[PDB]
Structures are given as C-alpha cells and as structure tokens.
Amino acid sequence: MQDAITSVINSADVQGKYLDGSAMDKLKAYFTTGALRVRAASTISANAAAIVKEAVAKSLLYSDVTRPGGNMYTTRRYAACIRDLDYYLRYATYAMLAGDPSILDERVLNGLKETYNSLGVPVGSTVQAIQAMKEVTAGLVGADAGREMGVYFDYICSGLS
Amino acid sequence: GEDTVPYERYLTPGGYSLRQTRPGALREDVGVKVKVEKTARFIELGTSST
Ligand SMILES: CCC1=C(C)/C(=C/C2=NC(=C\c3[nH]c(/C=C4\NC(=O)[C@H](C)[C@H]4CC)c(C)c3CCC(=O)O)/C(CCC(=O)O)=C2C)NC1=O
C-alpha cells in the first residue's frame, strides 16, 4: 500500500539518494493531477449504487447467468455479486486517489483468482461486468478522469484474467 | 642545414612567462600543489553496496 509519493520516496530510499529532479518532476505531476483525482473521487462516491446497477443492467442482466443454472442465480448470489462489484468500484476509486495500483494487487487481486476458481465464479462474465462499470464511470466523470479510472479497472481485469 | 626554414626554438623567460602563465593558458599544478579530490566518506559509506 503506497501512493505515487510513497513509491517515489521508496525508490529514492532504496537508492539511498536524495530526491533529484526526476523525482521532483514526478511529484509535480501527481500534485497537478491530484485535484482532478479528488473531484472524480467525490463524483464516484456520489453514484456508487447507480454505477453498479447500470453495470449489471448493461452486462449481466437478462443473460444466462441470472437464469437458473447461472452463478448469479439466487438472491444470495445476486447480493454477493453486487457486493463484489461494489468492492471493485471502491478499490478502483482508492487506486485512482493514490495514483498507484499497489492497493489493488495487495488487497483485491491477492487471492481473488483462486477464490473465484474454487467457488465456480465465471471470470469472463465478471471481467465484462467490470468493463461495463468502467464504461459507465467514464461516461460519468469525463474523458481524462475516466481514463485514469480505466487504467486501474484494466489493472483489475488483467489481474483477474 | 639547407633543408628547413627556421622556427622559434628558444623563448626568454619573459616571453614564456607572458604566454603560458596567462589564465586560459594556465594549468593548475604550476607553482603550488593541488590536493586530491575525493568524495566524502560518509557519502561513500551510505551507498547500497561495497
Ligand atoms: C475486496 C477484495 C475482495 C473480493 C473481490 C472478494 C470476493 C468474494 N466473492 C465471493 C462470492 C461471490 N462473488 C460472486 C460474483 C460473481 N459471480 C457471478 O456470476 C458474476 C459474474 C460475478 C459478479 C459480477 C457471486 C455470485 C458469489 C457467491 C458465490 C456463492 O455464494 O456460491 C466470495 C465468497 C464468500 C462470500 O460471499 O461472502 C469472496 C471472498 N473478496 C474480497 O476480499
């Protein structure tokens, strides 16, 4: 768990060097993008349940997975699916605020593949659900904030696949 | 000896003192010593390996 600042400090410390001009430029880049990160995080905190339910309405609804036999069939499985998608959106917001995806592979992508493979959860359908969540939130917060959200959404989909 | 045009073989100490000890023509050993330029030992010890 480290943001862009802590990773820059960790690189300069593992070097043992002081903060040179490249580290200063990286921190200036983060300190310019931080206000946009803050406003996108507020806008995403506004519409958590709406983004999640629009992602299910785009991908998972009216398909086979909500029908009998699907892994999203029962009300318990539906509630756990909404819980999993809320987790993905919340941690993508955290990784957007930090500017570093270390929290994603520390706390989402750690044992997620083995959990989903033990439960029988389809990984492709949940990857499509995360992609639709990314599409909806990029329609919500704009072009560049949607892109800096979608880089961590693509990180979650890549670590899941 | 009948093959070469002359050339300036000797200077006086006035003329050599004129041309060489000018600041751009100068070296930096020429008259007093220069000490060795090592890096600081606490920087050398603070690195990440011997
Ligand atoms: C914060 C990081 C983190 C994540 C992401 C996480 C996921 C996680 N998802 C689970 C279940 C689940 N996850 C899903 C989700 C899906 N199945 C589908 O068909 C859809 C494609 C997809 C949703 C988009 C479902 C249906 C279950 C329930 C499985 C069951 O009850 O048999 C379980 C099983 C235990 C429990 O429900 O409470 C865990 C631990 N745990 C974590 O600590």
From Swiss-Prot, chain A:
Binding site residues for (2R,3E)-phycocyanobilin: 81
Positions modified as N4-methylasparagine? 71
Described function: Light-harvesting photosynthetic bile pigment-protein from the phycobiliprotein complex. Allophycocyanin has a maximum absorption at approximately 650 nanometers.
The post-translation modification note in this UniProt entry reads:
Contains one covalently linked phycocyanobilin chromophore. The chromophore is added by the phycocyanobilin lyase CpcUS.
Name the Gene Ontology biological process terms.
photosynthesis
Q: Which organism is it from?
A: Picosynechococcus sp. (strain ATCC 27264 / PCC 7002 / PR-6) (Agmenellum quadruplicatum)
What superkingdom does the record give?
Answer: Bacteria
Which compartments does it reside in? Cellular thylakoid membrane
Q: Subunit structure, per the record?
A: Heterodimer of an alpha and a beta chain.
The way it spans or sits in the membrane comes to: Peripheral membrane protein
GO cellular component: a single term: plasma membrane-derived thylakoid membrane
Hey, which family's this protein in?
A: Belongs to the phycobiliprotein family.
Q: Which residues form a coiled coil?
A: none
Q: Which gene encodes it?
A: apcB
Q: What is this protein called?
A: Allophycocyanin beta subunit
Q: Matching InterPro entries, A to Z? A: Allophycocyanin_b, Globin-like_sf, Phycobilisome_asu/bsu, Phycobilisome_asu/bsu_sf
Keyword tags: Antenna complex, Bile pigment, Chromophore, Electron transport, Membrane, Methylation, Photosynthesis, Phycobilisome, Thylakoid, Transport
From Swiss-Prot, chain B:
**Superkingdom, taxonomy of origin:** Bacteria
Subunit composition? Answer: Heterodimer with ApcF (a variant beta-allophycocyanin). Phycobilisomes of this organism are composed of a two cylinder core, from which six rods radiate. The core is mainly composed of allophycocyanin alpha and beta chains and of minor components.
State the taxonomy lineage.
Bacteria, Bacillati, Cyanobacteriota, Cyanophyceae, Oscillatoriophycideae
UniProt PTM: Contains one covalently linked bilin chromophore. This protein autochromophorylates.
The similarity comment for this entry is: Belongs to the phycobilisome linker protein family.
Q: Origin organism of this chain? A: Picosynechococcus sp. (strain ATCC 27264 / PCC 7002 / PR-6)
This protein's name: Phycobiliprotein ApcE
- What does this protein do, in the record's words? This protein is postulated to act both as terminal energy acceptor (by its phycobilin-like domains) and as a linker polypeptide (by its repeats and arms) that stabilizes the phycobilisome core architecture. Has intrinsic bilin lyase activity.
Could you tell me where this protein is found in the cell? Cellular thylakoid membrane
Which gene produces this protein? apcE
First-to-last residue of the parent protein present:
641 to 690 of 886
